[PDB]
Design a protein around this ligand. Structure first.
Ligand SMILES: CCCS(=O)(=O)NCc1nc(-c2ccc(C(=O)NCCC(F)(F)F)cc2)cs1
Ligand SMILES: CCCS(=O)(=O)NCc1nc(-c2ccc(C(=O)NCCC(F)(F)F)cc2)cs1
Lengths: 193, 193
């Protein structure tokens, strides 16, 4: 049953909204998805493998949504251009808060996680740099910092700032404030200087 | 022996440069500091308590160094003003890389850690805001974003960007590049828009 893989995926996501990975059992997910402990293993080698797939979909979904924006350029000013771009991440991981949070914590313990995050971060930082450059090229943005070291810092900022907000960490920018907050700093620092 | 408290502090710091907390034993630290396992407990309730004190000194040392800068205003332009300020953190946690790294990882598992970090972050974000405001007041910086939400994002950026660098995480800005990278984004985003 593929239908059964999905039910394990929905169950985990659900159970993570109320408790941490270390507090969810394989039995929880099985019972949850309506199958036995040993049938669970037919789909996944572990619970961590379940978190992994979940993060992968979310990440892949943000990525796929960013491609779409790239291919259909929104007809607007530069400020909004950037805002639409940041919003893929605000919306995408904002609708998957429990997965975001657990997926970030797993980086500390799990190599596939740390490496999945790390690949996409490289990928989105590389895309940020190309756009910054293409902007410097048309004479819209000045040549200040290395475009790649700039992309890097901006992406890491957003990582940490979006996620602290979703968690309501303290301190954090309020979730209703974060988007405008992040866009102001991208835009001033790219066109300024 | 206070001399013995110190030797436990130096030992832990040393052993963290080559391995993680989960790979250091109380015996390691005792033997290391030249005393028995049961004498160790006379100074600290655990190894985590040892990490805690270490982080506390480093954090307190960054804080104390930032006060000093505040009280003796450096006679320079605004760019350098900010650079000197960011550098307290670049220098301070840059000279204590093993403590930084372990201290950040402990946030996930330990409440006193998460709360120590959280207090100072509030404190330094509040100081960033006062200075931004005092600058908006003298007509040097325009009224754009809420000064506090700006400080917040900038501080979280630096957190994540300094620490990824010290770790040589990937991606990261090169340690020789991070300072200028962080100062450009603070300055453009404060005086810009
Ligand atoms: C065709 C023009 C529109 S466009 O291509 O979408 N231009 C705006 C762009 N925005 C980005 C962008 C925007 C935001 C982020 C971002 O928040 N990175 C952090 C990822 C995470 F927060 F950690 F998940 C990364 C890249 C790249 S290009
Ligand atoms: C008297 C004028 C000189 S001044 O007071 O030092 N002005 C410059 C300032 N710089 C700051 C400042 C600079 C940097 C940081 C910072 O990097 N925060 C992150 C802390 C950590 F990276 F996570 F550790 C926080 C605050 C506050 S005020």
């Amino acid at each position: 049953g593929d239908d059964r893989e999905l039910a394990i995926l929905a169950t985990a996501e659900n159970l993570l909204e109320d408790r941490p990975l270390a507090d969810i059992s394989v039995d929880d997910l099985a019972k949850g998805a309506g199958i036995s402990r040993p049938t669970f293993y037919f789909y996944f080698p572990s619970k961590e493998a379940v978190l992994l797939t979940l993060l992968d979909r979310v990440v892949n979904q943000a990525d796929m949504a960013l491609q779409t924006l790239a291919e259909n350029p929104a007809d607007t000013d530069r400020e909004n251009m950037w805002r639409t771009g940041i919003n893929v991440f605000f919306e995408t991981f904002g609708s998957h808060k429990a997965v975001t949070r657990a997926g970030q914590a797993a980086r500390a313990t799990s190599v596939e996680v740390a490496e999945l995050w790390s690949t996409f971060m490289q990928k989105w930082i590389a895309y940020t740099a190309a756009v910054i450059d293409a902007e410097r090229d048309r004479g819209a943005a000045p040549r200040t910092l290395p475009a790649h070291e700039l992309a890097t810092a901006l992406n890491l900022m957003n990582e940490r700032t979006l996620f602290a907000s979703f968690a309501g960490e303290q301190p954090s920018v309020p979730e209703a404030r974060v988007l405008d907050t992040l866009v102001h700093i991208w835009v001033t620092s790219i066109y300024g200087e």
